[PDB]
Structure to design on (388 residues):
């Protein structure tokens, strides 16, 4: 039943491009997937469950991509190392704006969404801290702020800043400038002595 | 009618300390202020309007405080200059956690709240950019990223990071460490050459 489940997912991601989940019905998702309404309930308990699955797929895709970089570094300087890591998130979520927006708006009423985001953020923060620590160990970065607290703030900045740019918020950094903006902040705060 | 209006405001801020606005009724606010329910509607059209006023008071208090610092600098180094500026927000909103939380949760359904926050953020971003520019003009800070884009990201980081700390989110920087964390990121990214 992958086809019909994927068809429900694709339909949902497509519609979420024009309106919020609240304005999307199970029938819409059903008609979109070419199945009946009761048959939808065979794959998902609710439309909120569909969005959750969508976010879970986007989140894991970014995580897997980062995992790929971890295993296969890249012959380049330290500035580029961080840029490639940040780019994983700019590109993954930037290629799924509708789901990112819907996912954010869902956090307020979905503990599933909240816990999913929280778990990976902790995961991405722990990795950033490990890289910073490794960087400090080799003598490249000065031992300034506690690595994990620095990593948390930088990660929270990206979460908020990338979202603002993807959503075209007021205020926000233009999407065409956001990667460079974040990379500079990460690089100066990680290697800066003061 | 200041007394009764202020009594409605105080009552609301007090209750918001234990539960969300949704779990607070106009009667609660009414009983809390020692007036009847219909008399409440004499000062505010709704409870959502009360929270808006509360946020507006907290936002302006921070703005006025920053304005005071602008007019009356402080004989100290550049690192301390930024710390005092950031402290205005850490202290003002940190002394009104309930209203800050409620205010954030209200943004999703209140354009009044959204526009209020947006207007001052733009204002605080413009000021940060002016200081950065002044700093660059005098030769203290290197001309790296466009000042306004750097200012936007730093401000968005504070908004997200301070909120996470005040709310005790997972993940978050402990409140007792957040000021230092942010000041370091601001200082290194503003004066850092690379
Ligand atoms: C070697 C280099 C390492 C680089 C690590 C980079 C890690 C940064 C991870 C944080 C950024 C995540 C991108 C988020 C974009 C918009 O996020 C939305 O918020 C998603 C919706 C989820 C709901 C939760 C809302 C608080
Ligand atoms: C000379 C030094 C200048 C320093 C300037 C510092 C400016 C930083 C201003 C941004 C931080 C604001 C603090 C926010 C704390 C939590 O915010 C909540 O979000 C409030 C609720 C409002 C709802 C909107 C949610 C996006």
């Amino acid at each position: 039943g992958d086809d019909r489940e994927l068809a429900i997912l694709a339909t949902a991601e497509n519609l979420l491009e024009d309106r919020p989940l609240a304005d999307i019905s199970v029938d819409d998702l059903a008609k979109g997937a070419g199945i009946s309404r009761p048959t939808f309930y065979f794959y998902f308990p609710s439309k909120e469950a569909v969005l959750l699955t969508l976010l879970d797929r986007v989140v894991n895709q970014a995580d897997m991509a980062l995992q790929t970089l971890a295993e296969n570094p890249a012959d380049t300087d330290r500035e580029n190392m961080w840029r490639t890591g940040i780019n994983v998130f700019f590109e993954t979520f930037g290629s799924h704006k509708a789901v990112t927006r819907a996912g954010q708006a869902a956090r307020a009423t979905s503990v599933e969404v909240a816990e999913l985001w929280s778990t990976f953020m902790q995961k991405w923060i722990a990795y950033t801290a490990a890289v910073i620590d490794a960087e400090r160990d080799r003598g490249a970065a000065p031992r300034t702020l506690p690595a994990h607290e620095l990593a948390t703030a930088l990660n929270l900045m990206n979460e908020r800043t990338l979202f603002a740019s993807f959503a075209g918020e007021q205020p926000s950094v233009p999407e065409a400038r956001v990667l460079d903006t974040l990379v500079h902040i990460w690089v100066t705060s990680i290697y800066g002595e003061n």
Q: What stands out?
A: The pocket of hexadecyl octanoate (ligand 2) is lined by residues B 81-82, 85-86, 89, 93, 100, 103-104, 107, 117, 124, 128, 131, 155, 158-159, 162-163 (CB under 6 Å). The CA atoms of residues 44 and 50 of chain B lie 7 Å apart.
